[PDB]
């Protein structure tokens, strides 16, 4: 049993790829000079979409965060007062103003809120309250519970899409009908200076309206300009 | 036969480049004060200019999507309602009844509906009925049928420019003559207030008129203000 | 003894490739590109793979 | 010498290996790209050459 | 066999796995220059030398 041998040593890794690729305008300004968009808002198509590159299981979520919200606050960031002065005049403006439009249903989604996604189409008045409302959060680097919105994902670890590229042609066929996702900004102040879509800052998710007439019965925003940061965020799963 | 040997192994990909850059003005608005703007309306020349850099076939249409369009009724989004009231006055416009202008005709059409594309210069009066009239759909985010209308392509496989770029010297000499569009916009009211060249929504592309004498004889456009959302779409072919 | 290769690729903006030739010896000059194939073909967008064997044999 | 082999090198036709494909579809496009594609540049001609095709070497 | 693609083979181009590389193999197991019975062997000699499947890489 005479023994001859030579041996080689394979070693095999499997990076992990994960890529998240926007296009669009990484600013998007909300100009409000005539009474109509006073009224009824700017509606923006199309702003900005978001390709999903991934090896594992993937949820996407986008999350509102500013200077403000950095101290348990979730209101906009003040940025200038236009105007004098004005005792019935707030400038805290709720951080769940800003309303997310999505092409798409969450996938694979495992959730019963309001609404599990921005999946319904924008609504008119003091309707919907909540189906289209931003989650706020004072500290966007961790998942969010449950009964939070994800774009692409489930809190848990049973409601995860499966990994894939928008590039390949997947189940999902190819390009945007999978894992491209589109967005579509809109803010409605209203006439007398109010928000009547606002709504909770507890979970970002809840019915109860926020607007300026709940905290004041005749408050409304202050002349001025202020500032919002949203980040997308993907998470393995 | 003693054989020493190495090897190289080389990777090529031909990552696909779909761009679709747009100068100009993202917001475009039509005031309405005098008398002559009524009754002709205001015609505005080179307010959206579209440049295509591609590698592949690829096809560019122009879809009219509202708030509205989103329920299966395909009319301008009410934006505000000036005045106090009239039963013969119906806030409902049709989403055709914006016009479009191209600079140039299909570069490779294969299609017989009313016109392939905004190619004719604007008419006066109702005498075109579709020539110029915009593609109105209630989701702007699939290929429309082949008797709609295509800026720069076809909607089989057969009908397609070749991939290009625009600042590149390409058989369609450079620059504005070949992957360069530029579009106006035109909008025609009525001094009565009707809408003489309206279309039908079906298609977007028949000539049978939707004016408002046809659905009341004696209905005429509500004071006050209108969005509409306009979306270039480039698409592989 | 030191022989250094450099390798280079050129496609076109349409997607063909108006540097190929044949395959019966690899050394014709005949053009291969993908309009001699169909006149108005192109690579399709992708990746592909293609290996390199560098041999040496005893003369 | 160096040769060009792939995957589909191995079953007589002399094309590329498709690795992944972009897109969805398209009739006018063919996903099959020739092996002599691959442009190589040597640094010095052949030493000792005996041969009168096209180029007898890469320099 | 050359290497397929996809799920078409399953089984002509996998590694064989032994939890005792020390043993001879069962018939049924992949060899690659020889046989688990005492009748299916390769008969002595060496590369460097011209045997009967010429010399070198060949046999």
Avoid at 73 to 82: A, H, P, Q, Y
């Amino acid at each position: 049993n005479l023994i001859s041998e030579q041996n080689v040593t394979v070693t095999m890794d499997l990076q992990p790829v994960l890529q998240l690729s926007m296009q669009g305008s990484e600013t998007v300004s909300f100009v409000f000079s005539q009474i109509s968009e006073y009224i009824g808002g700017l509606t923006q198509y199309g702003a900005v979409d978001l390709s999903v590159s991934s090896t594992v299981d993937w949820c996407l979520y986008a999350a509102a965060f500013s200077s403000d919200a950095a101290d348990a606050e979730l209101n906009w960031t003040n940025m200038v007062t236009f105007g004098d002065s004005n005792p019935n005049s707030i400038t805290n403006l709720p951080i769940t103003v800003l309303q997310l439009f999505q092409s798409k249903p969450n996938p694979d989604t495992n959730s019963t809120a309001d609404s599990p996604s921005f999946a319904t189409a924008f609504d008119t008045g003091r309707a919907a309250l909540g189906e289209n409302n931003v989650y706020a959060s004072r500290d966007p680097f961790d998942r969010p519970s449950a009964d939070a919105r994800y774009i692409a994902g489930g809190n848990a670890g049973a409601a995860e899409v499966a990994g894939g590229s928008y590039l390949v042609d997947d189940g999902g066929a190819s390009g945007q009908n999978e894992f491209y996702f589109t967005i579509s900004f809109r803010v409605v102040p209203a006439l007398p200076g109010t928000y009547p879509r606002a709504t909770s800052e507890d979970q970002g998710n809840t019915d109860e309206t926020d607007d300026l007439v709940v905290r004041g019965d005749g408050r409304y925003a202050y002349p001025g300009v202020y500032t919002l940061n949203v980040k997308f965020v993907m998470v393995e799963c």
